PDB file of C-alpha atoms and ligand atoms in Angstrom:
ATOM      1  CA  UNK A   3     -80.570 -18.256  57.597  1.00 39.03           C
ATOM      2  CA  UNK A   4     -78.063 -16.917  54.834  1.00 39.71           C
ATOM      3  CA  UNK A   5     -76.411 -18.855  52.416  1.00 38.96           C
ATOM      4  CA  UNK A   6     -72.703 -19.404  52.422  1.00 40.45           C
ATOM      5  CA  UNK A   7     -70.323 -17.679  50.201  1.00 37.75           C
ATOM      6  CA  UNK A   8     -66.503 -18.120  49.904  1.00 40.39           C
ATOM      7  CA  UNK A   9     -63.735 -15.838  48.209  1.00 37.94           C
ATOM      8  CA  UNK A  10     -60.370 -18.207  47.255  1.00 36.04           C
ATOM      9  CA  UNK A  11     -57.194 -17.230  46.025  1.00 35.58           C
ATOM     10  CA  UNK A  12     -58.200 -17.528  42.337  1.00 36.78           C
ATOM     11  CA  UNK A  13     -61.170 -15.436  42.471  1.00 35.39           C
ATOM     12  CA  UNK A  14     -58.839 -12.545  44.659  1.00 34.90           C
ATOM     13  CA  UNK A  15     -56.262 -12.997  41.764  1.00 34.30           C
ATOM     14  CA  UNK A  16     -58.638 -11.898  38.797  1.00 32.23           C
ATOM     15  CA  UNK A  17     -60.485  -9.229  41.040  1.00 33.10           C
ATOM     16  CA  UNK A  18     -57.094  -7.587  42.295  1.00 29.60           C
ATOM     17  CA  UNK A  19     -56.556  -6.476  38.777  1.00 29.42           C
ATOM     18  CA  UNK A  20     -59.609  -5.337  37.986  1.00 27.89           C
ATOM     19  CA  UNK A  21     -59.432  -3.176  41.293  1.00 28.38           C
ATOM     20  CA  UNK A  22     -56.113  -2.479  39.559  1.00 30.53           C
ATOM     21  CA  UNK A  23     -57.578  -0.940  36.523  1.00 33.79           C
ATOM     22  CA  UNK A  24     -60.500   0.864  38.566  1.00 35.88           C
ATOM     23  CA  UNK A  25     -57.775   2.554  41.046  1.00 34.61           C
ATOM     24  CA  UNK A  26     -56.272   3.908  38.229  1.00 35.80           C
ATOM     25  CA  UNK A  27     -58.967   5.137  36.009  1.00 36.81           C
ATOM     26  CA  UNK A  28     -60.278   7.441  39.121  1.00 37.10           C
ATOM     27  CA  UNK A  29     -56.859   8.520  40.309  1.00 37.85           C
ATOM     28  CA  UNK A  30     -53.682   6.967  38.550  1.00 37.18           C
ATOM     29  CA  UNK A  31     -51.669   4.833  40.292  1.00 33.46           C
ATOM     30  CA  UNK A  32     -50.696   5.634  43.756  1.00 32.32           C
ATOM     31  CA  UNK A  33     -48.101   7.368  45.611  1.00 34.55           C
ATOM     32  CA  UNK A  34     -48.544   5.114  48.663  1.00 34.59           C
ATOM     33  CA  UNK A  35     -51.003   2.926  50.098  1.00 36.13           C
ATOM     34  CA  UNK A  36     -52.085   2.494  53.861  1.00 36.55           C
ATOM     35  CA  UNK A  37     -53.505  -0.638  54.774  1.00 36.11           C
ATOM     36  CA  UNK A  38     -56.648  -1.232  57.048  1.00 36.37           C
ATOM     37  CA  UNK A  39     -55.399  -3.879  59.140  1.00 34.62           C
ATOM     38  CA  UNK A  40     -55.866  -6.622  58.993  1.00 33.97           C
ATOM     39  CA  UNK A  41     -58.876  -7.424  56.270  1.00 33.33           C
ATOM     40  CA  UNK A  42     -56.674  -5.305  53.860  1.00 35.92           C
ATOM     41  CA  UNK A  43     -52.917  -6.780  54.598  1.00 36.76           C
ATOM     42  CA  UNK A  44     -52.583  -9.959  51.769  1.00 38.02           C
ATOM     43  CA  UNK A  45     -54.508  -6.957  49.046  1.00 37.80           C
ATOM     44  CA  UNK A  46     -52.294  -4.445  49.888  1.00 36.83           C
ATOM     45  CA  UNK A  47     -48.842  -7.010  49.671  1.00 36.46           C
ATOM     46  CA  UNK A  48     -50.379  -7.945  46.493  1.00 35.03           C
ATOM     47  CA  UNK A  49     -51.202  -4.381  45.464  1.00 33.46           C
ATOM     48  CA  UNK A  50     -48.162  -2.893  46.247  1.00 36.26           C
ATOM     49  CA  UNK A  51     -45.521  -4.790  44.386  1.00 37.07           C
ATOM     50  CA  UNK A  52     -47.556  -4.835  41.570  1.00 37.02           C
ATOM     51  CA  UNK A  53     -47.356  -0.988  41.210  1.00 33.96           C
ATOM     52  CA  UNK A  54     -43.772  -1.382  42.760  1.00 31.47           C
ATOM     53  CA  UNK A  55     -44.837   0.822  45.941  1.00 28.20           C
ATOM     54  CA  UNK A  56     -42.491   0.784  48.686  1.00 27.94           C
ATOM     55  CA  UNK A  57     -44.337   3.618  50.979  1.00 26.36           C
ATOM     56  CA  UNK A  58     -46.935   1.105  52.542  1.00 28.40           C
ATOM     57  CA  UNK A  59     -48.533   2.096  55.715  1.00 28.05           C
ATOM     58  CA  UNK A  60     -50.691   0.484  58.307  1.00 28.36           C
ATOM     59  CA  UNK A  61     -53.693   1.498  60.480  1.00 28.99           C
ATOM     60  CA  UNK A  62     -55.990  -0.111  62.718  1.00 28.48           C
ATOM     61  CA  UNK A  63     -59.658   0.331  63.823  1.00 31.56           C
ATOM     62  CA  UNK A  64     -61.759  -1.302  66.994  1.00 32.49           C
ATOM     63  CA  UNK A  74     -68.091   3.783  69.216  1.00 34.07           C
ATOM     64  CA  UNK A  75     -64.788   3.661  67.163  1.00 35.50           C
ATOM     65  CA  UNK A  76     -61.264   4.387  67.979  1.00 35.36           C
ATOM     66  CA  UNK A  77     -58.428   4.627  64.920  1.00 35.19           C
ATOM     67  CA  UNK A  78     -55.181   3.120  66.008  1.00 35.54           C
ATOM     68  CA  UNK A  79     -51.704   3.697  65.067  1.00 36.62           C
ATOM     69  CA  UNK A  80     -51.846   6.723  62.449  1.00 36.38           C
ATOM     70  CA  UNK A  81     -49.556   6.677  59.892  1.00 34.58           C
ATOM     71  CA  UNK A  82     -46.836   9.829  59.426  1.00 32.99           C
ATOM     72  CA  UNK A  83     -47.371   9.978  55.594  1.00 34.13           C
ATOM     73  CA  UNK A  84     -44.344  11.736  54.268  1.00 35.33           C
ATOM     74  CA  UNK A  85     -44.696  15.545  52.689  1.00 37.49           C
ATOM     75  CA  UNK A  86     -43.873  14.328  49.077  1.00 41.31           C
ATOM     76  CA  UNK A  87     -46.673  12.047  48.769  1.00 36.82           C
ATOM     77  CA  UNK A  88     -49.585  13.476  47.656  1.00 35.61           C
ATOM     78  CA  UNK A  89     -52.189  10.799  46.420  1.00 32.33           C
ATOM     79  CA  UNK A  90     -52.704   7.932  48.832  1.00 27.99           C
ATOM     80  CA  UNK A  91     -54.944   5.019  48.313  1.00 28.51           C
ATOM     81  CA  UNK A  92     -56.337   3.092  51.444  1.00 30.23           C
ATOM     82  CA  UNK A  93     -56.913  -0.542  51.199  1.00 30.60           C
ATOM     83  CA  UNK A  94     -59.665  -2.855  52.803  1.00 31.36           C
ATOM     84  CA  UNK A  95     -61.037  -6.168  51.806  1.00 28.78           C
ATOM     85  CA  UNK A  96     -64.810  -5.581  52.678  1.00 27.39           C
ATOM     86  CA  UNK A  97     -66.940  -2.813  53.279  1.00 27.35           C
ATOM     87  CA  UNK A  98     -69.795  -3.442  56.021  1.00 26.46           C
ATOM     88  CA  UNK A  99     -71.566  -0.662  58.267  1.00 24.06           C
ATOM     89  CA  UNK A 100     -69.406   1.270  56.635  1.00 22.58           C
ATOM     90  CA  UNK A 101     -68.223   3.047  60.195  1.00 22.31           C
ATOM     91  CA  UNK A 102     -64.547   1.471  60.591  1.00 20.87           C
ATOM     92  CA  UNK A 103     -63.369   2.774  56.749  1.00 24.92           C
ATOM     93  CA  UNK A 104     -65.036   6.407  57.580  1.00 29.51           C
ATOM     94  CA  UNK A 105     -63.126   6.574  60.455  1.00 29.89           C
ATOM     95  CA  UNK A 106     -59.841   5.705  58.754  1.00 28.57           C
ATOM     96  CA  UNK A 107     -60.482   8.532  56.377  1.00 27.36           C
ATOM     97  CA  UNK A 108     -61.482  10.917  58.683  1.00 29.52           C
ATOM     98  CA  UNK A 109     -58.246  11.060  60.673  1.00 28.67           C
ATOM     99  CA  UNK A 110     -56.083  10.180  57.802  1.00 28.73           C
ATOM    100  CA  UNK A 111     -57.374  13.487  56.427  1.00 30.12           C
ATOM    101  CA  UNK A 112     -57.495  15.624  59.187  1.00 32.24           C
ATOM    102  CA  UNK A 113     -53.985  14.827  59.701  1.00 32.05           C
ATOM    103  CA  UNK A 114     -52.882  15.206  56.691  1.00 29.94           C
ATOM    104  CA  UNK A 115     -55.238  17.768  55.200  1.00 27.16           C
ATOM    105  CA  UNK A 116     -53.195  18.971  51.876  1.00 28.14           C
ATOM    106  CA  UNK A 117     -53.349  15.245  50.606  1.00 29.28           C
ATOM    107  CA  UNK A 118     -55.509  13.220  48.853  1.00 29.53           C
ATOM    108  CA  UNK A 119     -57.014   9.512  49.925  1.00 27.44           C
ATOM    109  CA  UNK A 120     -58.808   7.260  47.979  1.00 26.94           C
ATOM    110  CA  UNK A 121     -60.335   4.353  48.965  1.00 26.59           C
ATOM    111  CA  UNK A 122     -60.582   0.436  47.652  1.00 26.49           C
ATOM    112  CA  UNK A 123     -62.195  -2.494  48.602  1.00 24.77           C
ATOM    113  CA  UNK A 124     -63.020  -5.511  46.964  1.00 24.63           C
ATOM    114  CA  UNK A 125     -66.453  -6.509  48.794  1.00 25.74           C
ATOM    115  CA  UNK A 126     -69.281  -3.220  49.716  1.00 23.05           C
ATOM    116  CA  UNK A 127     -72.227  -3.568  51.176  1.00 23.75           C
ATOM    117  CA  UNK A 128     -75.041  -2.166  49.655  1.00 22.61           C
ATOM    118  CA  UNK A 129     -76.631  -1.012  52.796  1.00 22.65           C
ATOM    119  CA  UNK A 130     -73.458   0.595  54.422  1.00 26.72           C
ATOM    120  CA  UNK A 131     -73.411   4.290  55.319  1.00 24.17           C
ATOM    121  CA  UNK A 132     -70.078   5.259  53.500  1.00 23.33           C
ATOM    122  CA  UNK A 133     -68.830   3.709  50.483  1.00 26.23           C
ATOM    123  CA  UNK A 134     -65.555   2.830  49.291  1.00 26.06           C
ATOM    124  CA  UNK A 135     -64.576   5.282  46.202  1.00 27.25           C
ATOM    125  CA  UNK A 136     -63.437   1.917  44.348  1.00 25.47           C
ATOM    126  CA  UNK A 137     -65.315  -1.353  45.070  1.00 26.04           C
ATOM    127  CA  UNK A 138     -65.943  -4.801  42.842  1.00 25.94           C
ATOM    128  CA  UNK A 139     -68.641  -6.477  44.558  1.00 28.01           C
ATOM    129  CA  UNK A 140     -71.885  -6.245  46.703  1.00 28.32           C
ATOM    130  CA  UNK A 141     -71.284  -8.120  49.682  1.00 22.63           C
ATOM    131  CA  UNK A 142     -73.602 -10.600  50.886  1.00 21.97           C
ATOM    132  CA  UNK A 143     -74.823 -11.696  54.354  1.00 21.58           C
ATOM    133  CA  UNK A 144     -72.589 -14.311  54.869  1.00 22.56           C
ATOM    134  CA  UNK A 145     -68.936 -14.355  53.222  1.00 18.57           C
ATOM    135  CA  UNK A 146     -65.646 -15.732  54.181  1.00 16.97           C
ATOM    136  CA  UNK A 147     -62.214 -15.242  52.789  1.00 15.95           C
ATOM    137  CA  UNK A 148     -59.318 -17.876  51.422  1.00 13.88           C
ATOM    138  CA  UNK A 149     -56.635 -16.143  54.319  1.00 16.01           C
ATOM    139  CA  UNK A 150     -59.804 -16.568  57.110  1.00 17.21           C
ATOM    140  CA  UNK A 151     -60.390 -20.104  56.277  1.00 12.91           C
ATOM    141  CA  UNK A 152     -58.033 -22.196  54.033  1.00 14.60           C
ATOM    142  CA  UNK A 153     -54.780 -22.859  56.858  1.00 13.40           C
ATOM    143  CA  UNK A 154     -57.597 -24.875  59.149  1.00 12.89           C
ATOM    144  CA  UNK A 155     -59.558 -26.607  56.440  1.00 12.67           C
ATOM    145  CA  UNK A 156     -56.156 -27.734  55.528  1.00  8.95           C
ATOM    146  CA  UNK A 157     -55.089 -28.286  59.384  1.00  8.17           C
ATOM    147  CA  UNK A 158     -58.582 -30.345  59.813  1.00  5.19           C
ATOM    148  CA  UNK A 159     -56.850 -32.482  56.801  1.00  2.00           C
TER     149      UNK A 159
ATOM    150  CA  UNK B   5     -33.248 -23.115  39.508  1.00  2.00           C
ATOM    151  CA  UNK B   6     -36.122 -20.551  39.428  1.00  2.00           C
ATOM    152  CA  UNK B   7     -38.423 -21.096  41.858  1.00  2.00           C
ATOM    153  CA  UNK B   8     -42.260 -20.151  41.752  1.00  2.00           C
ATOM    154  CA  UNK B   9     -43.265 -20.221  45.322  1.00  2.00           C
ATOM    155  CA  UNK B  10     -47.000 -20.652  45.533  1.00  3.20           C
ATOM    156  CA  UNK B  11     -49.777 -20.115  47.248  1.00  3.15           C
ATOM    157  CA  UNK B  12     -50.429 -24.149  47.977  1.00  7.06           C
ATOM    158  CA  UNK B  13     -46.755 -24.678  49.149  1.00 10.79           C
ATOM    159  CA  UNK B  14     -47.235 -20.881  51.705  1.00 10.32           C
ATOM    160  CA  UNK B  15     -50.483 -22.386  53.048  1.00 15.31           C
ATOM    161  CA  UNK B  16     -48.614 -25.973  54.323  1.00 16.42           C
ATOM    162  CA  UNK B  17     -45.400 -23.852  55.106  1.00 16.48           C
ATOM    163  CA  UNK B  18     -47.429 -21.434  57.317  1.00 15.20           C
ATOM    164  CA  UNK B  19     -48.672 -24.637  59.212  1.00 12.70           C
ATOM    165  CA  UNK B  20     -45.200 -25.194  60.045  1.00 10.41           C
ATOM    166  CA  UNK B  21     -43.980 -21.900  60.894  1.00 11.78           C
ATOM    167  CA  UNK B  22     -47.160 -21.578  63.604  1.00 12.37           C
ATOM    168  CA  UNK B  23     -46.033 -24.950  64.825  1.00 14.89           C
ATOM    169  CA  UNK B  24     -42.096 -24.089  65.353  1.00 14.74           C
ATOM    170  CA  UNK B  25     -42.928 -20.475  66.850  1.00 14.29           C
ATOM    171  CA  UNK B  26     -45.158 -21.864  69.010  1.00 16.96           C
ATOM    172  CA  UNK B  27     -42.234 -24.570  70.356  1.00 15.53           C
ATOM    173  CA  UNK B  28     -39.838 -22.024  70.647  1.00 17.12           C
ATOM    174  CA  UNK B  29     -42.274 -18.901  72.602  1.00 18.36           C
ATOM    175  CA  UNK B  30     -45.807 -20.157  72.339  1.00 18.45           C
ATOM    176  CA  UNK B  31     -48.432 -18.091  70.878  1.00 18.60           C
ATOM    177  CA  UNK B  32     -47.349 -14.921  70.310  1.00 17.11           C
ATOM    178  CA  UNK B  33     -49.481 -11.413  72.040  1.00 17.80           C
ATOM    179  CA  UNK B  34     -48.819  -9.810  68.882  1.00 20.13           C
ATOM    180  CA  UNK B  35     -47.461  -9.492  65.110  1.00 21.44           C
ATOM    181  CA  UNK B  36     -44.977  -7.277  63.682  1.00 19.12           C
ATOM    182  CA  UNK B  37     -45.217  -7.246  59.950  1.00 21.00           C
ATOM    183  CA  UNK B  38     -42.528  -6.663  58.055  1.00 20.21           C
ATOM    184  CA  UNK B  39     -43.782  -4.389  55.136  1.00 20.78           C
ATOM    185  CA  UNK B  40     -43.854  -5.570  52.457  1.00 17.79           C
ATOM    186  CA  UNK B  41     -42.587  -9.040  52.514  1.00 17.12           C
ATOM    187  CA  UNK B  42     -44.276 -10.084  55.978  1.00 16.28           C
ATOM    188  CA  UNK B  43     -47.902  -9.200  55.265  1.00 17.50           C
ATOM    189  CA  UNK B  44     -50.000 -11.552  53.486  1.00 18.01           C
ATOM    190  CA  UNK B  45     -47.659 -13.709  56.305  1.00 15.11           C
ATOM    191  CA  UNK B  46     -48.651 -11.386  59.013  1.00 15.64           C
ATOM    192  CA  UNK B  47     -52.420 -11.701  58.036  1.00 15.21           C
ATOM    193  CA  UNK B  48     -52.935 -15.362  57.773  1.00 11.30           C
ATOM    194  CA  UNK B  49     -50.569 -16.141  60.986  1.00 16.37           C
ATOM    195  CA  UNK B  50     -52.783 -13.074  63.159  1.00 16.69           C
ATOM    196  CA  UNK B  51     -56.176 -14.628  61.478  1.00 14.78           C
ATOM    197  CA  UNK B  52     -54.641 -18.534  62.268  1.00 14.62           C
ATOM    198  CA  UNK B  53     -53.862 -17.432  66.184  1.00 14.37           C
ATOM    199  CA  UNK B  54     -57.201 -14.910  66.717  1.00 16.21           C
ATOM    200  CA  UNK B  55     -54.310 -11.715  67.211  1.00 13.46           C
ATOM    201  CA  UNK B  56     -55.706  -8.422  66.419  1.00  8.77           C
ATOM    202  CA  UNK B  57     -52.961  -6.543  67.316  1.00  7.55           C
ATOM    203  CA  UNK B  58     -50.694  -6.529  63.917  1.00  8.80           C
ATOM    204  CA  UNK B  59     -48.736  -3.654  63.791  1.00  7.32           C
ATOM    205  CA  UNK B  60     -46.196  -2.667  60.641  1.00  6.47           C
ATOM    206  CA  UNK B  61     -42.841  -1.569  60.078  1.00  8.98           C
ATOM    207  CA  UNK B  62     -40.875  -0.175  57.183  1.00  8.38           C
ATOM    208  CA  UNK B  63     -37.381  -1.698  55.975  1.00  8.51           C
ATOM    209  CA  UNK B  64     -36.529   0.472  52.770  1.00  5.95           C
ATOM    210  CA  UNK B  65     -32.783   0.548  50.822  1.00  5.45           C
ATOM    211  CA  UNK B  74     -28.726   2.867  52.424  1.00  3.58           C
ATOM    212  CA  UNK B  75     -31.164   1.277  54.656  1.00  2.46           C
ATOM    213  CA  UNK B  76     -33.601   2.818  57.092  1.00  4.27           C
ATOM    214  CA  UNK B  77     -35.772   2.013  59.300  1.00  2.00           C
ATOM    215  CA  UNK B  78     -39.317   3.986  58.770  1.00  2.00           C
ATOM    216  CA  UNK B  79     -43.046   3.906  60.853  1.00  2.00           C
ATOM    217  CA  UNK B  80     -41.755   2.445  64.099  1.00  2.00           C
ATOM    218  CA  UNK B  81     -45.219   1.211  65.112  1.00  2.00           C
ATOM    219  CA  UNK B  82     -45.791   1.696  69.469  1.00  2.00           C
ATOM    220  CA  UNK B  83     -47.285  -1.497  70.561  1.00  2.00           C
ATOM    221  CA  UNK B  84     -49.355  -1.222  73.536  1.00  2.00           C
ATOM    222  CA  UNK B  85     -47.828  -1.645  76.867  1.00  2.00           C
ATOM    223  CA  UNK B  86     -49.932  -4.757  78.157  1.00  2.00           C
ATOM    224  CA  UNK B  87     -48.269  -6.770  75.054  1.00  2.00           C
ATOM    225  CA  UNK B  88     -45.333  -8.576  75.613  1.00  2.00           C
ATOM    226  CA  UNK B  89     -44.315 -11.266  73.819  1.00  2.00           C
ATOM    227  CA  UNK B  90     -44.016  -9.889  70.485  1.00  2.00           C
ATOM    228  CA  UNK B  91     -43.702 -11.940  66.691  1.00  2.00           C
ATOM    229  CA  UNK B  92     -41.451 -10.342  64.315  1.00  2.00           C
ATOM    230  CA  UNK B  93     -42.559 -11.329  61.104  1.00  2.00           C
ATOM    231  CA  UNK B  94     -40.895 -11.221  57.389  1.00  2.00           C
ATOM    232  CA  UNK B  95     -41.018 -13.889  53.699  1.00  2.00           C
ATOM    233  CA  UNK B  96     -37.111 -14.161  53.636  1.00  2.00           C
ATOM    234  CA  UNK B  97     -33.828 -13.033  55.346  1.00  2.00           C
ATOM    235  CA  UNK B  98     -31.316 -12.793  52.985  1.00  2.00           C
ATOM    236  CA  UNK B  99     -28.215 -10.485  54.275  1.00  2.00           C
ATOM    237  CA  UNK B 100     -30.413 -10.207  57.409  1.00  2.00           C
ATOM    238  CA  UNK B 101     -29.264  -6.767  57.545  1.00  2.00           C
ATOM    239  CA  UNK B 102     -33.010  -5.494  57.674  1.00  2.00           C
ATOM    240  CA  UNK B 103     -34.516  -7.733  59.658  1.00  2.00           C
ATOM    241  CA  UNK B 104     -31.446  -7.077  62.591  1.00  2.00           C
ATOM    242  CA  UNK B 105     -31.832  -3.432  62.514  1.00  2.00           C
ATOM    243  CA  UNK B 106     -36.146  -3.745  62.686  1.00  2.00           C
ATOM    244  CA  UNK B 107     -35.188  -5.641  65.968  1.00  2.00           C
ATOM    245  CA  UNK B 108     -33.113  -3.324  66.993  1.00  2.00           C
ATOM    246  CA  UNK B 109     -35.208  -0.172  66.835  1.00  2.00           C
ATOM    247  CA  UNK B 110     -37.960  -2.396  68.226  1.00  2.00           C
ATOM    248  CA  UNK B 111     -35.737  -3.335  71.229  1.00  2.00           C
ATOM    249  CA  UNK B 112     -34.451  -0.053  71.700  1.00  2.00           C
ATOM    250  CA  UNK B 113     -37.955   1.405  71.832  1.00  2.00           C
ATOM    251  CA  UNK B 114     -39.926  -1.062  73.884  1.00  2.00           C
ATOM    252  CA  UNK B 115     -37.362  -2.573  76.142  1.00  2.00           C
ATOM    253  CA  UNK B 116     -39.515  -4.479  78.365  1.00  2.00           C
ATOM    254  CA  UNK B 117     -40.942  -6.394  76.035  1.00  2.00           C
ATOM    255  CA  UNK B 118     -39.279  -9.810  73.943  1.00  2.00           C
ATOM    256  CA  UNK B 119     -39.163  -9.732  70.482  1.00  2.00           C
ATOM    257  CA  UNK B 120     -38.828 -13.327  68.753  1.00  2.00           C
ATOM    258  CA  UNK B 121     -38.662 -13.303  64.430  1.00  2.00           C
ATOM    259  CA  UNK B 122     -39.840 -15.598  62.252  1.00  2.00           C
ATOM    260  CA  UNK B 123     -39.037 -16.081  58.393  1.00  2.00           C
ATOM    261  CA  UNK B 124     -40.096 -18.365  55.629  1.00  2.00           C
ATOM    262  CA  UNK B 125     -36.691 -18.703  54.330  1.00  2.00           C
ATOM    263  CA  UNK B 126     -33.360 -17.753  55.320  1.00  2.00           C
ATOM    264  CA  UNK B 127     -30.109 -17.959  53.057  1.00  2.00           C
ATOM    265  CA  UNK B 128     -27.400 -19.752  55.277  1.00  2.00           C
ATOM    266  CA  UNK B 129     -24.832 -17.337  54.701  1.00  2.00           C
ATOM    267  CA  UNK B 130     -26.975 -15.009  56.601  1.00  2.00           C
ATOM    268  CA  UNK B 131     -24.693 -12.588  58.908  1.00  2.00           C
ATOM    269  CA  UNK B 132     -28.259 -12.163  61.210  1.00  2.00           C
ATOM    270  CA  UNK B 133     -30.423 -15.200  61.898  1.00  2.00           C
ATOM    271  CA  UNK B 134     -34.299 -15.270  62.501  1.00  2.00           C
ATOM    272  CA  UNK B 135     -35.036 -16.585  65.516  1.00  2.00           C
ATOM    273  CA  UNK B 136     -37.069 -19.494  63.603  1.00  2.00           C
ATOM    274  CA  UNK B 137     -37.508 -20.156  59.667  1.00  2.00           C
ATOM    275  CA  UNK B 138     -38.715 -23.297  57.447  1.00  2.00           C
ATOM    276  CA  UNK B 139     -36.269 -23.606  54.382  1.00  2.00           C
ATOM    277  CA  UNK B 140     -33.037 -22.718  53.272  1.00  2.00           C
ATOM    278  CA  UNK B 141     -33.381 -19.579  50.884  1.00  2.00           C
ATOM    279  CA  UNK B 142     -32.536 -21.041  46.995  1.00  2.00           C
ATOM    280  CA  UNK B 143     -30.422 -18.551  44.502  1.00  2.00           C
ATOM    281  CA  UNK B 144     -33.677 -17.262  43.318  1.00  2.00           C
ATOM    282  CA  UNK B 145     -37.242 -17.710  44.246  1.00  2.00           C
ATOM    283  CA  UNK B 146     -40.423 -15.959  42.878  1.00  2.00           C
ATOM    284  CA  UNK B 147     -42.920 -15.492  45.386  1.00  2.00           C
ATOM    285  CA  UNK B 148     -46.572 -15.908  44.503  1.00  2.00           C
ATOM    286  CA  UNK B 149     -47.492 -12.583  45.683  1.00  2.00           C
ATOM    287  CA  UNK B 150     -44.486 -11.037  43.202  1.00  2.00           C
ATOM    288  CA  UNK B 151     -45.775 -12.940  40.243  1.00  2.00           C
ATOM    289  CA  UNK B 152     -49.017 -14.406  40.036  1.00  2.00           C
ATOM    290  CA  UNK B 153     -50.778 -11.210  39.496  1.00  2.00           C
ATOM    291  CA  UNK B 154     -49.127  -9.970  36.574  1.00  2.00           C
ATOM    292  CA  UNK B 155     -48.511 -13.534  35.003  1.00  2.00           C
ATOM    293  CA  UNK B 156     -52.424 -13.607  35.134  1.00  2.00           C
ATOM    294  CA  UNK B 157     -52.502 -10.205  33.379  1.00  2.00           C
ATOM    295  CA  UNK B 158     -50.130 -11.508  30.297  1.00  2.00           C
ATOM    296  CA  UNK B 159     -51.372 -14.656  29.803  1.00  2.00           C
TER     297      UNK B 159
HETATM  298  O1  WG7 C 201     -34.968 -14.787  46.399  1.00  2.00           O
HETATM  299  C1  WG7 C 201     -35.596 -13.608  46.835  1.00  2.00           C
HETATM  300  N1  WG7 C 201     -36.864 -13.336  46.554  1.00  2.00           N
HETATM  301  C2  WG7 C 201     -37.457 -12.221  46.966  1.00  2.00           C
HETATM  302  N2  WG7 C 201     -36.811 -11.313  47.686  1.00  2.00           N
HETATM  303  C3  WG7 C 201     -35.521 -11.501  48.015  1.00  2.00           C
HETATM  304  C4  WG7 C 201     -34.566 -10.758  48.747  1.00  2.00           C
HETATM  305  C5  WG7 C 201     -34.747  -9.397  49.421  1.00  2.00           C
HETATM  306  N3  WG7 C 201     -35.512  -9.489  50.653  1.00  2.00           N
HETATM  307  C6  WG7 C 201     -34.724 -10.178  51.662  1.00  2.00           C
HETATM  308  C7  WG7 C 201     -34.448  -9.285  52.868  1.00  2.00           C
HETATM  309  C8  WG7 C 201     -33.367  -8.228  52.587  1.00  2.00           C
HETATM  310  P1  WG7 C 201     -31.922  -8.445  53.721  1.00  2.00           P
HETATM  311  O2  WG7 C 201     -31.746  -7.274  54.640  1.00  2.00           O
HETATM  312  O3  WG7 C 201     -32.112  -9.679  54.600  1.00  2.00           O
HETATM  313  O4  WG7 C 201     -30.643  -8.601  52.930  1.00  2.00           O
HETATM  314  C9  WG7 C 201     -33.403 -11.518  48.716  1.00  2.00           C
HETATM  315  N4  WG7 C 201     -33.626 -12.628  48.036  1.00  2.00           N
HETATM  316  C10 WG7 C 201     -34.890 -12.657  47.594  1.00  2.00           C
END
């Protein structure tokens, strides 16, 4: 069928600060992150002490329901969410959607290292087109080294 | 004395720390991450045991306690989750809350390291906390960047 591709540590590394440099040409650095959980939890560790952001929030997705909405405090104004692929597009829309409902004077940018080209909603910041088939050092490298 | 701990030495240490949690409550119904320290921890460990119910929590210095997550009332044995405990100050009063607020469920924590003099313990961690230690996810990304 598809061919097999496979994202390691190194390769995350040199993308994370080239998403770096993206995030901040389209809106400066952030005032806080919220993390899609969990494809965007290791990114958004790594993201967030590099810009030395403590206000780090979570949310989580499942014909969709958004789980555990972050209380994004008054003061913060720009707010980048984090994801580590992009594939229908339908869970990252959704995390937008009530983000911004709820917090409607605020504004949310999105980031994602993989995108689809065929998805329905786009990340405002993305490195690569995803293919079919493509798995990810934190999905696979503990049980390779297990099966060792 | 400095210590760079990297991302070879986290993957065989996260090996462990599945294997000792599991002796001590078995596989956990859910994580609690720790934010920040406990979340590339958080996502291998939920990836390593199939868990998709992660939920976060905010420690921030003084100290306070912010985003107390509500975990679903079906979960009950409940993985605490943070890189090290130091004064274990932050990781007693995360408990706490998350005691306080879901009282019928048991919370176990787990650490990486833990500095013996340590007024608060983690239920189960790997190594001794050194005087300093530098923590891939700290480092490697701007030591790439200057180099
Ligand atoms: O050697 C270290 N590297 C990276 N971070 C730390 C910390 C702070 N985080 C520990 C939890 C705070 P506490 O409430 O337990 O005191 C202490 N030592 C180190």
């Amino acid at each position: 069928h598809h061919h097999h591709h496979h994202y390691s540590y190194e390769t995350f590394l040199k993308d994370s600060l080239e998403l770096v440099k993206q995030v901040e040409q389209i809106c400066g650095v952030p005032e806080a992150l919220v993390c899609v959980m969990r494809g965007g939890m290791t990114l958004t560790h790594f993201l967030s002490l590099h810009w030395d952001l403590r206000e780090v929030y979570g949310i989580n997705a499942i014909a969709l329901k958004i789980e555990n909405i972050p209380t994004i405090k008054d003061h913060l104004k720009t707010i980048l969410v984090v994801d580590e692929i992009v594939d229908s597009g339908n869970s990252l829309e959704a995390v937008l959607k009530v983000l911004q409902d709820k917090h409607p004077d605020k504004k949310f940018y999105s980031a994602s290292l993989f995108q689809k080209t065929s998805a329905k909603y786009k990340a405002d910041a993305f490195l690569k087109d995803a293919p079919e088939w493509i798995d990810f050092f934190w999905e696979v490298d503990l049980k390779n080294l297990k099966s060792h």
